[PDB]
Design a protein around this ligand. Structure first.
Ligand SMILES: Cc1cn([C@H]2C[C@H](N=[N+]=[N-])[C@@H](CO)O2)c(=O)[nH]c1=O
Ligand SMILES: Cc1cn([C@H]2C[C@H](N=[N+]=[N-])[C@@H](CO)O2)c(=O)[nH]c1=O
Lengths: 440, 440
């Protein structure tokens, strides 16, 4: 003894770790007695040897239990505790509508979300375009908001799955991010710390997805579903498309605008609608708020149609210290960019493919995301009026409208947008927005 | 960029690293820009995927070049620069005779050695039983001693292969010590920093060896020979036996006594003689001081017989600030133990096997070695009069004579010695002391 090196050795040599060994190691990460080198070594043994279902469950539970785990029972709420997690993308603004929609249908959604990562936007960064919006309410205040409003969207505190914090920080500099068991455990350590009854996972497929192939997207989804249900949380996953921007916009303020306009019925991108609705349906069914797809859809459509979902969003924004008249007066509050100007393709044709990773990185480069954690976001910049795959583009239809912080910035963004998009003389074959549903 | 994570990823996915990539990574270890996690991750990828001959050479050269490399040309010496390295054992005192013997035959031996490790003794710890003996002469003083005496035995300074220091420190807590390419590179990074013409490797086989099987001992030897010769240093290896104590003693002062008595011809353990002579013969042949085995042996025997090797040892001890009359008066200087008492077997029989790892750990437990680096050694304790495999033991022949720091200490050592040794009603089959020689 001590065990940490023995545990690494055991996994290195292809043996399954016991629940005891996994818990010991995770606890050692938590109390800073296990070093970065030892975390990295174990991570790499897992990359090479994988983990069985029991190992994956142990690892997930251990990481979940390394910090605060929320419990709702004592509020005596009359609805299920339910949430959604996305692997991330570009224009992936679903949460801003989905939280209010499900809340309006009787769910309670304690959504611990995230900032932008690599080429992907982040829900917390989008919300921080709203002046005053506070992603870090205190423990008691968060509980009040969930009780009174039904939904809140917040950041990850120091008390949330702290062993995952160090594990992920090490993974991200040692080429051990790309491991299904590690990703599954990391995602669920955080989501399961919310004290959920039910969860839906959105695993992205395509050029803007983190997993590089459909098959790997599918395997991740399967892993998460298996582990989460193993933990007593009713969970399903949808594999959904990220071969183009999902919303009609990409950025921060611009995506909040899109969310509001979706909720009020001004404008609804049909692909964003399809994904948002499908994810909400899973939450209602898993949360036992509806018996089937048709009933779920009817309830969700009703709260869009009668303004209830929009009202919940407004109440959420107010409760998290944004403006009390935000839905009504968002234009007053959301910052506008210095220069807003359309980018047109160099030729006429059909949008045939769009490197959605490259589009994501273009927004980062404009100042709408970060390359390092200390970077400051410009909340106004990004894209609107995105062309979709199959759109005919010409002098009357741009590839996008670019919201830029100055003219030099606009030129570089326009260059990146054009480079990311290929035109063809025929429309590409259409693709489903939702490829598949994975259940226990 | 930067490359460190990309380099780990590349090796992780089974690709050979370039010389450039290896040099960059080693330099990053040297200047502390590459973290412990990144060292551990790379180490583990090498454990899983191994390294080709070109990778192994690059890694070795990079680590060698991370610090000071000695050059002798400017002293205009008339003999080869030659050295020996052992993988370590119990009673493995060969260097104390071999350095002086080879020096007396015209070699120059700048021996950078080591302290005890795990169950094994260390030449530097043995030498530090000699009052005043200084293992850290300054650069210029070391050169004077090599010029004037022909041999000196010293410790590893902060300037020696500093990238190896951090690499090994990480390996030793992350279960990445046990890798042939990593061991080879670590050993040779240090030895090749001596500016050698020739080198002999002693790779131990058996229960007191670090490599757990003959086949793995053999593979390590082959790796070291290939890499060293690739680096322009004429190198051979002997696989030698460590299924019992090599010398008739194990410890610090007790082994220095044995060395002196070997050199003066008072007493020569025949197995220790065989290994010592065989290693010296390799050095003379590789260093071109003799054309064949017979001539080498004749020259080495002559310097034993005429007192020259003993005189060189005395001059080395004096030059390194030990006593000037040490060979003559060692009994005055080497510390004696509080209690010296024979341990007898519980029954009569032939010594059939001896767990030489356990015997090594018994010396550590007596206070003759360390469990952690801060531990203080008692230089007097250990074993003498070791029984050998095939010895009949009874009331007239003990298993060993134990030199202990007090009576409680003696009892625990006696218990460990008895537990480490199995008797049989017949002598075991004899085994060679030198199994094989490996050349380029
Ligand atoms: C932010 C974060 C990302 N990741 C993974 C999820 C993403 N993979 N997928 N799908 C990946 C992107 O580098 O990082 C993680 O495992 N834990 C975390 O806390
Ligand atoms: C002291 C030291 C040991 N080691 C290895 C050599 C030993 N293996 N063999 N033969 C091993 C013992 O744990 O550590 C190393 O690679 N570099 C070092 O600096």
């Amino acid at each position: 003894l001590f065990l940490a090196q023995e545990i690494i050795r055991k996994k290195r040599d292809g043996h399954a770790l016991s629940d005891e060994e996994i818990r010991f190691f995770i606890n050692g990460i938590r109390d800073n007695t296990i070093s970065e080198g030892q975390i990295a070594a174990l991570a790499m043994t897992i990359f090479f040897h994988d983990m069985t279902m029991p190992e994956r469950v142990s690892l997930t539970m251990a990481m979940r239990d390394s910090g605060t785990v929320l419990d709702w029972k004592s509020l005596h709420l009359n609805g299920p505790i339910v949430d959604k997690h996305s692997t991330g993308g570009v224009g992936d603004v679903t949460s801003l509508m989905l939280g209010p929609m499900v809340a309006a249908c009787g769910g309670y959604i304690p959504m611990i979300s995230g900032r932008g990562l690599g080429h992907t936007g982040g829900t917390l960064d989008k919300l921080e375009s709203i002046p005053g919006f506070d992603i870090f309410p205190d423990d008691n205040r968060f509980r009040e908001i969930i009780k009174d409003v039904g939904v809140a969207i917040i950041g990850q505190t120091s008390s949330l799955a702290p062993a995952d914090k160090r594990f992920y920080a090490t993974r991200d500099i040692t080429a051990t991010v790309d491991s299904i068991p590690l990703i599954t455990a990391s995602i669920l350590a955080k989501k399961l710390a919310e004290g959920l009854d039910a969860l839906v996972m959105d695993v992205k497929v395509g050029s803007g997805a983190f997993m590089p192939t459909y098959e790997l997207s599918e395997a991740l989804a399967e892993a998460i579903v298996g582990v989460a249900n193993g933990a007593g949380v009713r969970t399903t996953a949808l594999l959904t498309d990220m071969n183009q921007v999902l919303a009609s916009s990409a950025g921060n303020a611009v995506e909040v605008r899109e969310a509001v306009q979706f909720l009020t019925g001004e404008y609804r991108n049909p692909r964003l609608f399809d994904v948002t609705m499908a994810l909400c349906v899973e939450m209602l069914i898993s949360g036992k708020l509806a018996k089937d797809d048709a009933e779920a859809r009817a309830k969700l459509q009703a709260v869009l149609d009668n303004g209830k979902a929009a009202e919940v969003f407004g109440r959420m924004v107010a409760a998290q210290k944004g403006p009390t008249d935000f839905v009504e007066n968002y234009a007053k509050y959301l910052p506008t960019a210095m220069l807003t100007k359309a980018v047109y393709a160099d030729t006429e044709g059909f949008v045939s493919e769009m490197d959605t990773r490259a589009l994501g990185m273009a927004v980062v480069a404009m100042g709408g995301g970060r390359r390092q954690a200390s970077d400051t976001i410009d909340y106004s910049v990004g894209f609107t009026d995105m062309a979709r795959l199959g759109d005919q583009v010409d002098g009357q239809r741009p590839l996008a409208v670019i919201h830029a912080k100055d003219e030099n910035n606009w030129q570089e963004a326009a260059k990146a947008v054009k480079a990311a998009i290929k035109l063809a003389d025929k429309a590409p074959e259409s693709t489903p927005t939702v490829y598949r549903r994975i259940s226990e």
